[PDB]
Amino acid sequence: QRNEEKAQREANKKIEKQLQKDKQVYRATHRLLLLGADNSGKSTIVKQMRIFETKFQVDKVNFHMFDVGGQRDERRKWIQCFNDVTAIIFVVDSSDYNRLQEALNLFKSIWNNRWLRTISVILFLNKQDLLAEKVLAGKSKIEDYFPEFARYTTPEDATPEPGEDPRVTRAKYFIRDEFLRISTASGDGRHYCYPHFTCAVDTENARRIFNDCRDIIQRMHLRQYELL
Amino acid sequence: QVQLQESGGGLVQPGGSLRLSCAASGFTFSNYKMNWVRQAPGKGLEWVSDISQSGASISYTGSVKGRFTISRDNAKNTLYLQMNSLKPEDTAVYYCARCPAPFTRDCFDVTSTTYAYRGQGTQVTVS
Amino acid sequence: IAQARKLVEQLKMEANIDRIKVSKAAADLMAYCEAHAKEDPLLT
Amino acid sequence: DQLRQEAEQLKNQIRDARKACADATLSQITNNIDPVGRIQMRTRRTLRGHLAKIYAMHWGTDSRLLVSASQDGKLIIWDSYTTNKVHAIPLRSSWVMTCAYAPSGNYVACGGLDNICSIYNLKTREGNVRVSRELAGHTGRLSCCRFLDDNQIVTSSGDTTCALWDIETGQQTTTFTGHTGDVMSLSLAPDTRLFVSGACDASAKLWDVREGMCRQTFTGHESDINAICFFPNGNAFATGSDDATCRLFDLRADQELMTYSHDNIICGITSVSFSKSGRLLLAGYDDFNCNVWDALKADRAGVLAGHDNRVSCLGVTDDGMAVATGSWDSFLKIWN
Amino acid sequence: IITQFIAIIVITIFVCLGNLVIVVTLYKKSYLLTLSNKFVFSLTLSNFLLSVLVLPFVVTSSIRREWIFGVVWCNFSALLYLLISSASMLTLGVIAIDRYYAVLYPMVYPMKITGNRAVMALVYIWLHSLIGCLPPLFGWSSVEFDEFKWMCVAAWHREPGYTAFWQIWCALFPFLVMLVCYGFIFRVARVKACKALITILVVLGAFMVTWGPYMVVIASEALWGKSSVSPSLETWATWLSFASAVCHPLIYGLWNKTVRKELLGM
Ligand SMILES: CC(C)CCC[C@@H](C)[C@H]1CC[C@H]2[C@@H]3CC=C4C[C@@H](O)CC[C@]4(C)[C@H]3CC[C@]12C
Known part of the structure; x- marks a missing residue:
């Protein structure tokens, strides 16, 4: 019996060595949950940094994002799996005002979820060019879908892209502030929403995700060393 | 089993009024955020309005804000949506939906194909 | 229509079954327990 | 409209029959027998080494080998007494929501939101564990996998379906359909001729593997059903849901029997298991604690509070000696 | 003054309890022994060794007004006191470097x-x-x-x-x-x-x-x-030196959430 116990001992030693190596590998990789809907450029975002899995590397740090699109419309069960993720990358088409309200409902539910109230959300208001064209055309008015836009003024801290129609900036920052209102209503400071104005042709979304996650981890480290 | 039986609706001229009630059975009515979701012909489900557990937090879709009012009767275990100054775009099948989890501010209830805790709905034609 | 027909058929099949008294069933569960109570180290 | 009216009439008849059979309540009849009282259970061993949250565990037919699946991409096979990892299988997909350990002990299974049940052969001549088979065909995630034998395996998916697979051929021998919500858990009968599956439509369903049709359907919860498992006798099963309640159903009675809940609990339930005698209902909760309920009195007999996060795994040995709780703090504990 | 003696009888009991508790907490369960907690384990272990092998002799010397343990043991005790004080004070700097790396460089911290x-x-x-x-x-x-x-x-x-x-x-x-x-x-x-x-x-x-x-x-x-320096000021400076071995374990073990939680649980 002693030989069997000894053999089990070196088996345990080998497996524990393997798990130490795998912990070193696992803690150095950050998991991100990619969320969105149809007509939202989740696929374009995934491909622009080069399915169920997407592997990318920024500053020798390995991020893994996951477009869970092999399931049905219901999300309440398989979204519980993604709480150890560092961030939820929520991509939304700002042009479609119809399905914008569904997007606000989804963002509100993700923000207020019990298992996602610690996971910060990186908000990608994608397809800003589409929104610009829609507002410049004027055929579809945002006030029909949001009457509050009729009484919304551009905040003084806005930093619009130079050479932009102020109506476009007003609409963009209006939808951004609509998301940020849900963000700050019950944030409690543990998680923050980081809005970004992204298009299909941009090539720096990976850097935004990297900096956002670095901010998240900085806040977590300050939290564990009880600084703030 | 969970039941949500809707009453009201029908044919109403534009600019008219209606009161869609729906009675809920099979659960504690006060614990769930209640929603009104309408589905127009030729398109998918659209969330119209929601009212929270105590009725303090009320929200509407922007298109129907001001015109339509949400209300929740805990004693009668029912949800009312009052529609006034109707428009032709308001014709749809109307459902009252529970948010799946009690004592929660989050829910996923605009599912395209099937949602387990949604009512049978009523037809509301505005013409 | 297919979903409604399948639901009706399933409801008919469920109603066609034969049920028993709840007292007999409580009795049966209590029974399983009393019988296996000795071989259950968690309770004893 | 006629079909809907007929369905309503059939439902009314079913409720009338259930009420007629409901001569007395379980609690009233069971009030005569003495309660088991407060149950004190402590962490004998803390099987640690998992790098992330654990979603499933399963005891072997031998009451020593257990198998635990965690999103750090691992299926670790432990020897319970010596706290020694017998095996550590890396997984193709990190998100495994279920795992099984074959009754013969030669095989294990994994499955999750990858939509494939991967079966690994343990007793292989060539040393390390290798991937025996892969079962694809479920269009939704997989939430529970159970072995009938070395060739028959039942897998429940999030696409409102269950499937009996012949492992050798690798194709779905039978498909069980009729749920309207994501099937979150299943359990096989001790006889392994019937099995119940609970879904997100607050509905449990008794299925016969041979026939392939829904033998029975049970309702009574208010929200998603997360766990289900037969009574040791195979004539009953307990289900936990997101509305902080358990409910016990008997297959022959064809309705609920007892409801386990309290005002002070509002978190949902995530895992339910039974002891040998069926006296104790071990249920995992989102409030970081397990509860043990008395099947006869429905009063909490003890709290297993040693986890830093929600408990997602409950496993009870075949011989009933030990129970193991797996939580999202990457810890698996055994409470003897 | 009997007061000065009384103070050491309190500072020593603290440097022993507040360091041994952290040492046993970090040793009975090694998943806590990540890099930071290891630097914290070395600190607490060294301070506990100081409290066991130096402080009782300090107390006996203060009460007896004289050394009674011989030249060789005097040399050993002073060597241990210097070594442990240096190690404990340097572990603070190493822990501060670790926190600097974890706060300023959080992506590359595991690497x-x-x-x-x-x-x-x-x-x-x-x-x-x-x-x-x-x-x-x-x-x-x-x-x-x-x-x-x-x-x-x-x-x-x-x-x-x-x-x-x-x-x-x-x-x-x-x-x-x-x-x-x-x-x-x-x-x-x-x-x-x-x-x-x-x-x-x-x-x-x-x-x-x-x-x-x-x-x-x-x-x-x-x-x-x-x-x-007057005798009182020098004596109290020595007692503050030994109370540093109270300040180190409390701050670097209990103000950490995870160590604190496990410890409190134990
Ligand atoms: C000379 C002075 C300024 C130095 C500071 C004294 C030390 C001993 C103080 C400073 C901050 C204090 C901590 C404040 C908060 C906590 C968390 C609480 O759960 C009790 C322990 C703990 C960890 C305290 C222990 C004592 C402590 C560490």
């Missing part, structure tokens, strides 16, 4: 700091302490019962050079590292979000209050000679 590198730094802690403590073996100066301090430690007055060396090597090195790192962590934290001031001040001030008075006393004795 730039590794368990092998953690062991390298932990061994460097004691190598630096031994480089600070070997001259007593080499006879740069001497260890003798110092009456007001109440226990043998090196004669600072006789050799100002060794006193200055010990201050520069094992006393101000840890401070400069500790403050620089906590202040950089501060620029970051105020930018990010008043508790930062509270924690920086408590961490730096425990170190200052406990060790700086002793530095002033030994510097005055080395420069201005003996009797430049």
Whole structure:
């Protein structure tokens, strides 16, 4: 019996060595949950940094994002799996005002979820060019879908892209502030929403995700060393 | 089993009024955020309005804000949506939906194909 | 229509079954327990 | 409209029959027998080494080998007494929501939101564990996998379906359909001729593997059903849901029997298991604690509070000696 | 004064309990022993060894007014006291470096700091302490019962050079590292979000209050000679030196959430 116990001992030693190596590998990789809907450029975002899995590397740090699109419309069960993720990358088409309200409902539910109230959300208001064209055309008015836009003024801290129609900036920052209102209503400071104005042709979304996650981890480290 | 039986609706001229009630059975009515979701012909489900557990937090879709009012009767275990100054775009099948989890501010209830805790709905034609 | 027909058929099949008294069933569960109570180290 | 009216009439008849059979309540009849009282259970061993949250565990037919699946991409096979990892299988997909350990002990299974049940052969001549088979065909995630034998395996998916697979051929021998919500858990009968599956439509369903049709359907919860498992006798099963309640159903009675809940609990339930005698209902909760309920009195007999996060795994040995709780703090504990 | 004795009888009991509890917490369960907790385990273990192997002799010397353990044991006790004090004060600087890396560089933290590198730094802690403590073996100066301090430690007055060396090597090195790192962590934290001031001040001030008075006393004795400091001030400076072994374990074990939780649970 002693030989069997000894053999089990070196088996345990080998497996524990393997798990130490795998912990070193696992803690150095950050998991991100990619969320969105149809007509939202989740696929374009995934491909622009080069399915169920997407592997990318920024500053020798390995991020893994996951477009869970092999399931049905219901999300309440398989979204519980993604709480150890560092961030939820929520991509939304700002042009479609119809399905914008569904997007606000989804963002509100993700923000207020019990298992996602610690996971910060990186908000990608994608397809800003589409929104610009829609507002410049004027055929579809945002006030029909949001009457509050009729009484919304551009905040003084806005930093619009130079050479932009102020109506476009007003609409963009209006939808951004609509998301940020849900963000700050019950944030409690543990998680923050980081809005970004992204298009299909941009090539720096990976850097935004990297900096956002670095901010998240900085806040977590300050939290564990009880600084703030 | 969970039941949500809707009453009201029908044919109403534009600019008219209606009161869609729906009675809920099979659960504690006060614990769930209640929603009104309408589905127009030729398109998918659209969330119209929601009212929270105590009725303090009320929200509407922007298109129907001001015109339509949400209300929740805990004693009668029912949800009312009052529609006034109707428009032709308001014709749809109307459902009252529970948010799946009690004592929660989050829910996923605009599912395209099937949602387990949604009512049978009523037809509301505005013409 | 297919979903409604399948639901009706399933409801008919469920109603066609034969049920028993709840007292007999409580009795049966209590029974399983009393019988296996000795071989259950968690309770004893 | 006629079909809907007929369905309503059939439902009314079913409720009338259930009420007629409901001569007395379980609690009233069971009030005569003495309660088991407060149950004190402590962490004998803390099987640690998992790098992330654990979603499933399963005891072997031998009451020593257990198998635990965690999103750090691992299926670790432990020897319970010596706290020694017998095996550590890396997984193709990190998100495994279920795992099984074959009754013969030669095989294990994994499955999750990858939509494939991967079966690994343990007793292989060539040393390390290798991937025996892969079962694809479920269009939704997989939430529970159970072995009938070395060739028959039942897998429940999030696409409102269950499937009996012949492992050798690798194709779905039978498909069980009729749920309207994501099937979150299943359990096989001790006889392994019937099995119940609970879904997100607050509905449990008794299925016969041979026939392939829904033998029975049970309702009574208010929200998603997360766990289900037969009574040791195979004539009953307990289900936990997101509305902080358990409910016990008997297959022959064809309705609920007892409801386990309290005002002070509002978190949902995530895992339910039974002891040998069926006296104790071990249920995992989102409030970081397990509860043990008395099947006869429905009063909490003890709290297993040693986890830093929600408990997602409950496993009870075949011989009933030990129970193991797996939580999202990457810890698996055994409470003897 | 019996009061001064009374104080050591309290500081020693603390340096033993507050370090042994953390040591047993980190040893009975090794998943906590990540790099930080290991530097914290070494600190608490060394301080507990000091409380067991040095402090009782300090108490007996203070009550007996004289040394009663012989020259060889006097040398060993002073060597252990110097070694442990240097190691404990340097572990603070190493922990501050670790927190600087984890706060300023959070993406590359699992890579730039590794368990092998953690062991390298932990061994460097004691190598630096031994480089600070070997001259007593080499006879740069001497260890003798110092009456007001109440226990043998090196004669600072006789050799100002060794006193200055010990201050520069094992006393101000840890401070400069500790403050620089906590202040950089501060620029970051105020930018990010008043508790930062509270924690920086408590961490730096425990170190200052406990060790700086002793530095002033030994510097005055080395420069201005003996009797430049009154017996009460010198004795209380020594007790503050030994109370540093109370301040270190509390701050670096209990103000950590995870250690605290497990400990509290135990
Ligand atoms: C000389 C002075 C300034 C130095 C500071 C004294 C030390 C001993 C103080 C400073 C901050 C204090 C901590 C404040 C908060 C906590 C968390 C709580 O659960 C009790 C323990 C703990 C961890 C305290 C223990 C004592 C403590 C560490």
